[PDB]
Every structure is written in C-alpha cells, then in structure tokens.
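User: I'm designing a mutation panel for Green fluorescent protein and want to avoid disrupting the core. Could you give me a predicted structure to guide residue selection? Please restate the sequence first so the numbering is unambiguous.

Assistant: Good idea. Sequence first, for numbering, then the predicted structure tokens:
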Amino acid sequence: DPMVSKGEELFTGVVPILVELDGDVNGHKFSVSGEGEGDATYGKLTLKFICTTGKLPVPWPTLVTTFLMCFARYPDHMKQHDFFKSAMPEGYVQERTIFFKDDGNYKTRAEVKFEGDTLVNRIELKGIDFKEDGNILGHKLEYNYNSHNVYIMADKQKNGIKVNFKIRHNIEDGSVQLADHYQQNTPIGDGPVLLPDNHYLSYQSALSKDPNEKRDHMVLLEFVTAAGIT
C-alpha cells in the first residue's frame, strides 16, 4: 500500500527529533529545547529536554504529554488507523487544553512535521489560573510517570482526530494531581490522510536525569503501542 509505505516509509528507521517550546504560566515565561530520536518500528522515543531560560517554573512531569504520536508502533493489522504518520511529511497541528483538577489549565498548540530529515515538534504553551501553592507552582509532584492508555477517535468533520485522556501525577502524600487532556489533531497539508476507527495508544514513560548536566533538564524514554482493535 503506497500510502502505508510512504507516510510509513519516513518512520521505518531511527529519525532525529527536535522539540522547541515557548511557555508562559501565570506570566512566568520560559523556553525549552529538546533533542533525541524515535524508532517507530519499536514504538520508542528517547529525548533530552533543557530549560534554556534558567529554572523551569513548573514540574517537568506536567510537560511530558506536550513534548510525538507519529512514533507509535501500529501493529501490521492496524496500519490503516495510523493518522499521525499518514499526515507526514507536511505534518499536523496538535492542540490541547489540559485541565489540572482544582487548579489552572495549559493550552497548547504544536506543529509536528519534517524539516529535512529531522522530525520537529514546535510548541506554544499558555497556562492560566494556577494556584501559587498548588501542586504545579508549588513543585509538589514526584519526578516520575505512570503508564496510561490514550483513546483515539476520528473527528471526520475536521479531517483529523480527537483524543481524550486523564493523566494522574503522583504526589508525596499518596494523592494524585489529575490532568484532564482534551486534544485535537488536524493535518497541515491538503492531501489524503487516514481517519481511524476508535482505538488506543498505550504509553509507558520513564523520566531520568543526565548526571553530567547542570542545566535544568529532563530525560524522557517513552514506548508507545497502538491496540484496541482485535
């Protein structure tokens, strides 16, 4: 299937990734750059993010979902449901509002597309209404991350997909900070894309530090696999 080979032909091997975020939370401005690589054959991402403005004013875990669904591994029987790769190389827009339970919200807009051989994720983030002593600006969240399934549905009228899901961020008294995500993705080019049947992506994420790195940073290892269609 030359659509599977093509959009899929761009992710059959290791792909370099670049991530660039500009953020403003309750007026605190910050920027983050990231570099790494993705191996969609194995559903694998490995990335290192650096805050280039000094100290990150929010917890690094709260940015994990914002900082690449095109690197999911779709099983051969599910390849007709891979919207993310079908939009490449011209790419897609990924937008979210993330509602932090009892606290503020992030609104994000990203464009994910190829620049030459490098897959780029360029993001703008605005957060509003955070509590000075809540879990986000309080830096109350553990530096860790739970596995989550993400439910993908078509948004036919928008020629894209919508995605809903809840992240639970653990806190060091046993409670969690819920972050309710509402997502929409839409193609940047005008060409054909795959609008899937409902399915999910299974995510596992591990966060770590580069022991040699003095800048504020996060190392993120993610494995993502599609399922939910027998």
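For picking mutation sites, this is relevant: The domain at 1-230 is CATH 2.40.155.10 (Green Fluorescent Protein). Helices lie at 2-7, 83-86.
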